[PDB]
Amino acid sequence: TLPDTVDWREKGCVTEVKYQGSCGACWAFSAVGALEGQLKLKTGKLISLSAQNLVDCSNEEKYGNKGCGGGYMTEAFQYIIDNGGIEADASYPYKAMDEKCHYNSKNRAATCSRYIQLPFGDEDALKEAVATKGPVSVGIDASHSSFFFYKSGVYDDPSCTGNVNHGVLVVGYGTLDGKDYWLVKNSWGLNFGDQGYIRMARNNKNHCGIASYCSYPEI
Ligand SMILES: *C(=N)C1(NC(=O)[C@@H]2C[C@@H](S(=O)(=O)c3ccc(N4CCN(CC)CC4)cc3Cl)CN2C(=O)C2(C(F)(F)F)CC2)CC1
Q: Where found, per UniProt?
């Protein structure tokens, strides 16, 4: 039986909200966010991991990531698996540009053995994973201006679609004033939403495609 409310921030499993700038690195922030959660759960250390390492080093046909042109959280995990590691943000900081890969194994801060994909559209499966596994990478339709107007409450825009376009991180869930929500960490800095987070409608027919393309890594 699952808890009614989850917030991984309260368990010390979520790092500071990052600022992607004008580089299309949402996917990279989503992926490192999920892996940060696992790293904390396994090792006890919370460390921001290198989104830039993903941007610079997985921009090739093998993965189909495009650096600042966008990419996939699953393929980010595959890169980390193939590479045998990823650096921390502190040693490989975010530049918001496509740069030549300069991964240094001496600076490895995390690994990935495999990743898990949840069933398409299944908000119950996402609830279970968030409750029991940790933060989960997801795709959403974040293309409507209302998304950037959000400040409080639960985002529930009838114009949202299942055609996703941005990777974000689900770090919890609950019910706010009778409305089920997913607690979502973005990568637009503190000024976005509620201190960088948005609560998005949950159990409302897979609203904004939030449970369409969910994945998480294993250390
Ligand atoms: C973030 N700053 C930006 N968005 C992206 O990088 C997104 C993240 C993901 S996604 O969440 O939008 C997405 C889209 C489609 C899938 N598919 C559908 C087709 N299936 C096979 C039939 C496989 C899964 C999964 C996900 Cl996670 C991809 N993003 C992109 O922008 C694209 C690309 F990666 F190619 F760059 C355009 C897809 C950059 C705004």
A: Lysosome; Secreted; Cytoplasmic vesicle, Phagosome
